[PDB]
Amino acid sequence: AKDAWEIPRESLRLEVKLGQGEVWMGTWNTRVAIKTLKPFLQEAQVMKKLRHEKLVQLYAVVSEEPIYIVTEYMSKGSLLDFLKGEMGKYLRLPQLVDMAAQIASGMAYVERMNYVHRDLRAANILVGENLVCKVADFPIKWTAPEAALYGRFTIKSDVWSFGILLTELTTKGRVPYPGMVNREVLDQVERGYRMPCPPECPESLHDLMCQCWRKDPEERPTFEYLQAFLEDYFTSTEPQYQPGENL
Numbered sequence: 734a735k736d737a738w739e740i741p742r743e744s745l746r747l748e749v750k751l752g753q754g755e756v757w758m759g760t761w762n763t764r765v766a767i768k769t770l771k772p773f774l775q776e777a778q779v780m781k782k783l784r785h786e787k788l789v790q791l792y793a794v795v796s797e798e799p800i801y802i803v804t805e806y807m808s809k810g811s812l813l814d815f816l817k818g819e820m821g822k823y824l825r826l827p828q829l830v831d832m833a834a835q836i837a838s839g840m841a842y843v844e845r846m847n848y849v850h851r852d853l854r855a856a857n858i859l860v861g862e863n864l865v866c867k868v869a870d871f872p873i874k875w876t877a878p879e880a881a882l883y884g885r886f887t888i889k890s891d892v893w894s895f896g897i898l899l900t901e902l903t904t905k906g907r908v909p910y911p912g913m914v915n916r917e918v919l920d921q922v923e924r925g926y927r928m929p930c931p932p933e934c935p936e937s938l939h940d941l942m943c944q945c946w947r948k949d950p951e952e953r954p955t956f957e958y959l960q961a962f963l964e965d966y967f968t969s970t971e972p973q974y975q976p977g978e979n980l
């Protein structure tokens with residue numbers, strides 16, 4: 734049965750509840766997060782095969798119900814909470830582009846590795862100290878049309894979501910497509926609609942969103958492209974950038 738990721742439940746001290754399965758902060762045998770699932774192995778092979786700096790790191794599993802997935806602790810919760818908290822009003826484009834870059838990097842690794850995330854959006858990004866961001870957790874509004882309608886999930890659909898994630902970052906956590914219910918979105922993105930440029934955000938960054946929301950999966954950029962473009966941004970793209978009232 735068990736593989737070398739197995740640890741005994743006894744080695745874990747659950748302490749702070751973080752959200753309700755459930756997520757607890759804890760101790761081993763080392764501060765850790767434990768995801769717990771309300772009463773499986775094959776579909777956990779994903780997180781065990783992928784080790785990288787900008788992806789939340791797996792530490793161990795308890796493969797007996799109730800199942801415990803144990804990972805590194807991300808001191809600042811979801812990117813979505815972080816954007817919506819006290820920190821929101823102090824964030825600007827430098828910080829937000831940089832966060833976007835780290836995510837793109839984790840993702841570009843997933844790309845090399847030949848995997849697909851499937852649920853990429855700020856709720857599944859985790860923030861540590863010093864604005865470290867890490868991809869976690871391997872719905873229509875964040876989904877590419879071909880995936881929402883025909884099940885065609887590929888790294889290209891992940892790219893689509895990334896483009897939506899950039900509106901979350903640049904609106905400091907706002908739900909995409911303000912005012913539309915799901916049906917209206919699916920109907921409208923099919924008719925060709927796309928979110929306009931967020932207030933105070935450079936046209937060049939909204940242009941990058943639009944390449945991500947190209948109707949042809951194959952024509953959307955690579956994450957490796959996104960990673961570099963975001964890394965090089967305030968030199969190669971907006972050298973004249975000045976801080977606004979919000980970005």
Ligand SMILES: CC(C)n1nc(-c2cccc(O)c2)c2c(N)ncnc21
Pocket residue numbers: 751752756766767768789802803804805806807808809810811859869870
């Ligand atoms: C935001 C939420 C309570 N949370 N989920 C976490 C996890 C998210 C996704 C999968 C996990 O196994 C655990 C997490 C963490 N590792 N550190 C701190 N907070 C965390």
